[PDB]
Design a protein around this nucleic acid. Structure first.
Ligand SMILES: Nc1ncnc2c1ncn2[C@@H]1O[C@H](COP(=O)(O)OP(=O)(O)O)[C@@H](O)[C@H]1O
Ligand SMILES: Nc1ncnc2c1ncn2[C@@H]1O[C@H](COP(=O)(O)OP(=O)(O)O)[C@@H](O)[C@H]1O
Ligand SMILES: [Mg+2]
Ligand SMILES: [Mg+2]
Ligand SMILES: [Mn+2]
Ligand SMILES: [Mn+2]
Lengths: 368, 374, 381, 374
DNA sequence: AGTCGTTGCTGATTGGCGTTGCCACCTCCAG
DNA sequence: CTGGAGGTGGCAACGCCAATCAGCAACGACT
C-alpha cells in the first residue's frame, strides 16, 4: 500500500506580474504519471490547494482537469482546506467530488473514513482533519481534539491490521519558515509541540513550504510545496513523499524530486558584480525565460537604476521580476515602517504606541 | 505608447472622413510635427479624436453618449474616430462610432459602437464601454485621468497638476505608482472607528486616536502622508528635466501635510518661494517639465513614447521659446514623438513637418491636405 | 422523446440587495420533480445560467446541487452560455460535468452531438449553439463603420448557423432523429437577428427573452422565458417552462408548464390614499415570505418625506417595501416676454406670481402660499 | 473708475520705487498701451499691484496679511502700492503697505497699514482694513469678484465667468445689479422651514412646499430663478458687442435652470450649440464680449471706463487678431481706455506706446523705463 | 518721558470633510 | 426606434468643525 503526500499547491497564485499556470500543469501531469507508475493507492493534499478564497478561472480549470485525469488512473484522493483555502470554495463542490473517488474536507468534526485499496479492500483510516479554525473549536484544545479524533478512529478500526493516518495544517516547533508562509493564530498560539500528536502510524502536514522531519521521529513529516513559491527557496529541490505501509505499520518513506521547469535565480552585490553575474545567461537561449530577483547594493534611486538594469537585460534571454535595494521609494518600504514613521512625528509614548501598533496590524491583516 | 494612425469622420469642423497615417514618408523620422491653421479650423479636433477613440471622452466635453453628443458636426448623421497605437511592440486598434436614427440629422442618438482589437492578429479584445476602458487602462498603464496629465496637455490645462487639490494629486500619484493599500487601510480604519462609535451609541478612544492620525473616508490623510516619498521621487526627475528647459529654477517639496512643490530661485541666492508666485511662462515650463517627469516615473513598467501639448507656447518670449524648443528637440533624440499646437510664427517656421488644417470660408467647415482624404 | 426548454435562470442575482437563493432552490426541486413525473429524456438551458461572470458561492452551490441531484433521474442535461455568464466560468466544469450525464457548451465551434434516450438509444441531434460572442466568430478590420460592422456580424452568425446545421444533417444521415437547435439571441420574426435566417431545424430552443412567446408564428421556434420573475415589470405574469415531445423524427407538440410562484410581488400606483387603499388588502394575511412591493406615487406636488410615510403605513403590515419613486421632473426658469422688463422694475410679489404661474396648483393653496410669502416680507420690515 | 496714477515699491521682480502716471505726455490720447517685455519681467506685476492697492488681494495670491506675505521682493524689508482713481468726476487715493520688523530682510511681518483718502482735500476716509474694503466697495460699486470679472482679465481666467458654476454666477449678477433681496427671501424661507421642522402641523407642510419652490440656504435657488432677466439683458448686450468683435457667432440663454449661455452659429444655418464646443479663440472673444457687457450693464448706475487684458491674444490667429484689435480700437475711441499685455509680434507694431519692462542680465530683478522712476 | 514700534490676547468668517440625497450613464432587455 | 428597469457612481446642498484674519490692549527700543 502506497500514498503520495503533497501539500501547499497554492493554485492560482500570481507571482508578481507572472502566473504559475504552466508550472502547475507540468507538475500535475507529472504527479499523475508517477502515481500510475508507482500504482499508488491514494493521493493526499493537506491544505493550501488555492492561493486565495476566490481563485481565478484557470486555477479551477487546472484543479478540475487534474481530478478528471485522476479517474483514468484509479487512485483515491483527499483534499483538505488550508489557512489560505476557504470554506464554500472547496466545500461547495464536495458533493460532485464524491462521485469521482474524491473526498473533500474543509470543516472540522468529520468522522474518520476508511481508505480503500486499488482492489477495494480497506487500506487504512484517514482521520481527515483540516486547518482547524479557532472558532470551530487552544493548545490543549488542538491536542484533545486530535486525541479524541484518533480515539474515535481507533474504535472504528478495532482489531483490524491497518495503519492509522492523521492530517493537519499547522506550524510546529523546530520548523523553518519562509516569506511566503502566512502566519496563523497571530494572537493566541505561537507553535504546536510535536510531542502532542496522537500515536498515529503516520502524520501528513502542510503550511511549511520546506520539507522537514519534525520532532525527530519519522512518522511525522512536512512535505512542503511542490514548486518554489518564494525567491528565498529557489535553489532547494522540492519533494513529494511516497509512504508505504505493511502489516499495520510503516514500512518506508521515499522522496521524489519534482523536475523544475521554470528556472529562477537571485543576484547579489553591487552593479559591477551584477553586470558579471548576468553573463551566466549570455547567448544560452533558455527557452523558458528565467525569473530574477536582483538585490542591488547601491544607494542610487530605484526608478533610475531599473532603467540600466533593463538595458543590460534587453540583450539577454532573461526577464527580471523584482529589484530591491540592499533615496527610498514608496515601492520599497513596508507598511509597518511607513505607519511607524507617522507615529514618530506624534508623541512617542509606548503606552499608546503598543496599542496603536496592534490595532494597525490587525487592520492590515483584515485587509489581507 | 505611440500613435500609428488616426482616422476620424465628421468631428467638429472636420466634415467628411479623414485618415492621418503616421510612419509614412513625412513622419518617418519621428521628428517634430506641428498642426497649423487659423483659429476655429479644427486643430484641437485632431487631438480630440485621439482621446475620444481611446477613452470615450474629450477634454472639452465631459461625456459623449446617447443622451448628448456635441462633438459630431451639424447637418450630419454619424461620426466616428479610430486610432492605431503600439504598446510594447504590439499594435492595437481602438474604435468609437455613433449614428443618428434613420440616418437623419434630426433623429435621436443611438448607443455608441466601441471595439478594441489587435492590429496584426485581428482578434477582438473588447466590445463594451466598461470592458474596453478597463482593458485599455490595464494595457497602456494609464487611463484618461493619467493620459490628460502625462501624455496630452490640453489647451489652458497645463497647470492642472500644480493647481489641483492635494487629494487629486495624491490620487494620481497612487494611480501611477499602484500604492492603494494605504488608502484602503485609512478607509477601513475610518469605517471601523465609525462602527465602534455607533456601537457605543476603551476601544472607542483608541479607534478615534488612530482615525485622527491616519483615518479618513476614501483614505485622504494616509494617502497624502504616504505619497510624500513618491512626490520626492517625482521632484528629482522634474529637476532633471527642468534643468534643460529653464535653467533658472529648481523644484523642492513643501514641508507641509498638503503635499505641494516649492521652487528654488538659483539666481536669487537660492531663495525658496511658493509655486504660486511663478510667472505664466515659468509656470508653463515647470508644468511641462513636471509632466515629462511624471511620464518618466513609470518608464520601467509602461513607457510613454509620445507627447501632445496645445498652444502653451504663446506665453513665452522669443528667447525662452527658443530654449524650450531646443530642449524639446534634444528630448526628441530619445524617440519621444512631440506634436505641438501653436500660432507662433517663429516656431511654425522652425518646425518643417506640418499638418495644415485649411479652413473653408462661409461654410464653417474645414479640410486637411488632399493626401489625408479617404 | 421528451425534453424541457428553460433559460434565464440568472442564478446568484441580487434584486435590490435581496437574494433569490430560496426561490431558485424551490424552482430547481420542482423542476426535478416534474422531470421525474414526465419521464423526460433531456433538459436544455438556453443561456444566462449565472447573473454574472463570477457568481457568488451559493449560486455555484445551487448549480452543483442540481447537477448532482439530477443523477437520480438519469435524464441528460444540456447547459448553454448566455450573454450574462462567463465562457471561462462555464468551461471550468466542462470535463467534470462530462462524467455526470451533463454537457455544457460555452464556446463556438462545438460539433453537433447525439442526445441518448433514457434507455441509451440515439434520440435526437442536439446541434448546440451558445451565445456567439463577436470576438469568437469575426475578425475586426480597419476602415468600417458602426453599421457595416453589425452587418458583417449578422452575415457571419447566419453563415455559422447554416454551416453548423449542414454538419448536423450530415451527422444525422438517414436515421429519423429530430435536429433540435439552440441559441441565445434577439429575434423580431437593425441589429436583431431575423427569424427567417434560421435553418430549417425541427425545433429551435432560443434564449435572451424573459417572456414566453412564439416568433413569426412558427411554433417550432420559441422563447421559453425566465422561470421566475426577475423584475417588477413582470411580477404579475405567470412563468412557463416548455415540455416538448417528438415523434417519428418530427416535432409533435409543445406544452406549457406553470412554475409555481414562491416569492409573491406586487406593484402599486396612485397617490398616498390609493396606496393605503391597495395596502388594505393585506391587512390580515399570513404571508410566507412577505410580499415585495414597488410603489409609484403619482405626483400632485405633495413634496413630503414619503419614505417615512411608507414606513409607517407598512410597519404593522406583513409587507416589505423594496422601492418607491415619483415623477417630479420639471424645469424651473423665468421666460422673458419682452426685453423691456428688467429685474429692478418687477416687484417681488410680481416675480413670485410668475414663479407660481409655472406650477399648476389651484386656489385651494395659492391664497395660503401667497399669505405665507407675504409674511416673510412682513417680518423683514 | 479710471486709473489715474499707479505707484508701487518693491513688488515681485520690480525692485525699488516706481510710479506710472496715465496723464503724462504718453497716454494723453487714452489709447492702447501695451505692457511689453520678456517673460518674468513684472508685466503681470503691474496689474497685480493695481489689484493689491484696490482690494488687498492679488489674482495669484489669495490674501496678503500679517502672515504668508510672498508678494514682497526678496531681501527687502518694505513694500507698498498706491493708486489714484476717479469716480463720478472726483479722484481718490488708495494705499497699502507692509514692512518687516526692525526693517530687516527677515523678521516678523508687521500688520499692514492701509488708507483711503480724497485728492480734493486730503481727508482720510478710512484706515482700518475692513472699513476701507467696505467703503471702497460702496464707492466704486465693484468688489474684488466684480473687478476681476469686468475690469481686469487675468491670464487664463478670461473664461472664468463663462465656466463659472451657476451659484457664483447668480451671486455675481445679483450684487452687480443691486437686486439682492431674492437671496434674503430664500434664506428667510429656509430658516423658517427648518425652525418649524425642528419643533416636531399643516403650517409645516405649507412651509415645506414653499421651501421646495424657492427656499434654499444661502439663497441659491430663488436667486438663480430670478436672475434670468438679468442674464437675458446681459446676453443681449454681449451679443450687440460681439456682432463687431466676431461676426460668426451670436449669444442667447438656454432653457435650463442653470444660468447658461448658448451660441447660435449664423454660418451653419443658425445651428445652436453649447459654449463648451467653442474653440479657444472663440471662447476668448465670447468672454471678452461678456466682460464688456458686464461693464455696460451698470453704466446707468456706476460707470467704469478702464479695461485690462493680461493675456489670451495668442490663442488668436493673425487674420482674426487684426479684427479684434480694430474692434478694440473702435471701443477705445469712446471714453473707455484699455491696456493689453501680449508677446505676439503683430501687436508690437499696432500699439505705438508701450510700458516696456526689462530684466537685468540675470540678476533676478527687473526695471522699467527710467522716466517712471521715483 | 515720550513716542513710536513690536508683541500677546478675543470674535467673526471661511474653507474642509462627512452625510444624505438626486441625477446621470451603462447594460439588458420589452413595447 | 424607443423606452425602461436596475445597478453604479458622481455631484451638490447642508451640517459641524477647526484654522485664520482683524481688532484690541500691554511692553521694548530710540530719541
Ligand atoms: N458640433 C459641431 N458642429 C460643427 N462645428 C463645431 C461643432 N462643435 C464645435 N465646432 C467648431 O469646430 C471648430 C473646432 O476648432 P478647434 O479645433 O477648437 O480650434 P483650435 O485648434 O483653434 O482650438 C470650432 O469652430 C468650433 O466652434
Ligand atoms: N517674492 C518674490 N520676490 C522676487 N521675485 C518674485 C517674487 N514673487 C515672484 N517673483 C518673480 O517676479 C516675476 C514676475 O513676473 P510676471 O509679471 O509674472 O511675468 P509675466 O508678465 O511674463 O507673466 C517672476 O520672475 C516671478 O518669479
Ligand atoms: Mg503673466
Ligand atoms: Mg484650441
Ligand atoms: Mn498554509
Ligand atoms: Mn502553504
Amino acid at each position: 500500500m502506497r500514498i503520495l503526500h503533497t501539500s501547499d499547491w497554492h493554485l492560482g497564485q500570481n507571482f508578481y506580474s507572472k502566473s504559475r499556470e504552466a508550472e502547475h500543469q507540468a507538475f500535475l501531469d507529472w504527479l499523475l504519471e508517477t502515481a500510475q507508475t508507482h500504482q499508488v493507492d491514494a493521493i493526499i493534499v493537506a491544505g493550501d490547494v488555492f492561493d486565495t478564497g476566490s481563485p481565478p478561472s484557470y486555477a479551477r480549470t487546472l484543479y478540475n482537469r487534474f481530478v478528471v485525469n485522476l479517474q483514468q488512473t484509479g487512485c483515491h484522493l483527499v483534499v483538505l482546506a488550508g489557512n489560505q483555502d476557504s470554506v464554500a470554495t472547496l466545500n461547495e463542490s464536495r458533493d460532485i467530488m464524491a462521485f469521482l473517488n474524491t473526498t473533500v474536507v474543509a470543516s472540522a468534526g468529520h468522522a474518520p473514513q476508511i481508505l480503500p485499496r486499488r482492489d477495494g479492500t480497506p487500506g487504512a483510516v484517514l482521520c481527515p482533519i483540516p486547518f482547524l479554525r479557532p472558532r470551530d473549536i487552544l493548545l490543549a484544545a488542538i491536542t484533545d481534539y486530535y486525541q479524541q479524533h484518533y480515539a474515535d478512529a481507533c474504535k472504528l478500526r478495532g482489531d483490524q491490521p491497518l495503519p492509522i493516518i492523521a492530517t493537519g495544517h499547522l506550524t510546529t516547533v523546530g520548523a523553518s519558515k519562509s516569506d511566503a508562509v502566512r502566519d496563523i493564530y497571530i494572537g493566541t498560539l505561537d507553535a504546536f509541540p510535536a510531542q502532542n500528536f496522537p500515536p498515529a502510524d503516520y502524520i501528513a502536514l502542510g503550511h511549511i513550504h520546506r520539507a522537514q522531519i519534525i520532532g525527530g521521529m519519522e512518522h511525522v513529516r512536512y512535505c512542503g510545496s511542490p514548486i518554489p513559491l518564494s525567491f528565498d527557496e529557489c535553489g532547494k529541490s522540492k519533494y513529494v513523499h511516497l509512504v508505504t505501509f505493511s502489516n499495520g505499520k510503516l514500512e518506508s518513506v521515499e522522496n521524489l524530486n519534482v523536475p523544475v521547469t521554470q528556472p529562477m535565480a537571485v543576484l547579489k552585490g553591487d552593479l559591477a558584480s551584477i553586470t558579471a553575474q548576468l553573463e551566466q545567461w549570455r547567448d544560452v537561449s533558455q527557452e523558458p525565460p528565467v525569473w530574477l530577483d536582483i538585490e542591488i547594493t547601491t544607494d542610487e534611486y530605484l526608478h533610475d537604476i531599473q532603467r540600466k538594469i533593463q538595458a543590460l537585460t534587453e540583450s539577454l534571454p532573461v526577464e527580471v521580476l523584482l529589484v530591491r535595494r540592499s533615496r527610498e521609494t514608496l515601492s520599497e518600504l513596508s507598511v509597518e515602517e511607513v505607519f511607524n514613521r507617522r507615529l514618530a512625528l506624534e508623541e512617542l509614548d509606548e503606552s499608546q504606541q503598543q496599542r496603536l501598533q496592534h490595532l494597525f496590524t490587525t487592520t492590515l491583516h483584515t485587509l489581507a | 505608447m505611440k500613435i500609428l494612425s488616426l482616422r476620424l469622420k465628421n468631428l467638429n469642423s472636420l466634415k467628411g472622413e479623414w485618415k492621418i497615417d503616421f510612419t509614412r514618408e513625412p513622419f518617418a523620422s519621428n521628428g517634430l510635427f506641428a498642426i497649423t491653421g487659423p483659429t476655429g479650423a479644427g486643430k484641437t479636433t485632431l487631438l480630440d479624436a485621439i482621446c475620444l477613440a481611446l477613452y470615450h471622452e474629450t477634454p472639452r466635453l465631459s461625456n459623449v453618449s446617447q443622451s448628448q453628443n456635441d462633438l459630431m458636426t451639424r447637418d450630419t448623421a454619424e461620426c466616428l474616430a479610430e486610432v492605431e497605437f503600439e504598446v510594447k511592440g504590439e499594435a492595437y486598434r481602438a474604435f468609437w462610432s455613433q449614428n443618428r436614427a434613420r440616418n437623419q440629422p434630426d433623429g435621436n442618438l443611438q448607443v455608441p459602437r466601441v471595439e478594441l482589437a489587435r492590429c496584426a492578429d485581428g482578434k477582438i479584445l473588447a466590445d463594451k464601454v466598461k470592458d474596453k476602458l478597463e482593458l485599455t487602462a490595464t494595457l497602456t498603464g494609464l487611463d484618461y485621468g493619467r493620459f490628460t496629465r502625462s501624455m496630452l496637455l490640453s489647451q489652458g490645462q497645463f497647470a492642472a497638476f500644480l493647481n489641483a487639490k492635494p487629494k487629486e494629486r495624491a490620487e494620481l500619484l497612487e494611480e501611477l505608482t499602484g500604492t492603494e493599500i494605504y488608502g484602503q487601510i485609512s478607509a477601513m480604519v475610518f469605517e471601523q472607528h465609525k462602527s465602534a462609535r455607533t456601537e457605543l451609541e476603551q476601544q472607542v478612544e483608541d479607534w478615534g486616536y488612530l482615525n485622527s492620525l491616519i483615518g479618513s473616508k476614501e483614505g485622504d490623510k494616509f494617502r497624502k502622508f504616504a505619497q510624500g516619498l513618491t512626490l520626492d521621487n517625482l521632484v528629482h526627475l522634474a529637476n532633471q528635466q527642468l534643468t534643460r528647459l529653464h535653467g533658472r529654477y529648481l523644484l523642492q517639496r513643501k514641508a507641509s501635510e498638503a503635499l505641494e512643490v516649492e521652487v528654488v530661485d538659483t539666481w536669487q541666492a537660492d531663495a525658496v518661494r511658493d509655486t504660486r508666485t511663478l510667472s505664466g511662462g515659468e509656470s508653463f515650463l515647470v508644468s511641462l517639465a513636471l509632466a515629462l517627469a511624471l511620464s518618466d516615473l513609470v518608464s520601467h513598467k509602461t513607457r510613454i513614447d509620445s507627447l501632445f501639448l496645445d498652444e502653451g507656447f504663446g506665453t513665452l518670449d522669443s528667447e525662452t521659446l527658443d530654449t524650450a524648443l531646443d530642449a524639446l528637440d534634444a528630448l526628441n533624440a530619445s524617440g519621444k514623438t512631440i506634436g505641438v499646437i501653436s500660432h507662433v510664427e517663429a516656431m511654425k517656421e522652425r518646425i518643417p513637418v506640418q499638418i495644415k488644417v485649411k479652413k473653408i470660408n462661409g461654410l464653417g467647415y474645414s479640410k486637411l491636405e488632399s493626401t489625408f482624404a479617404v
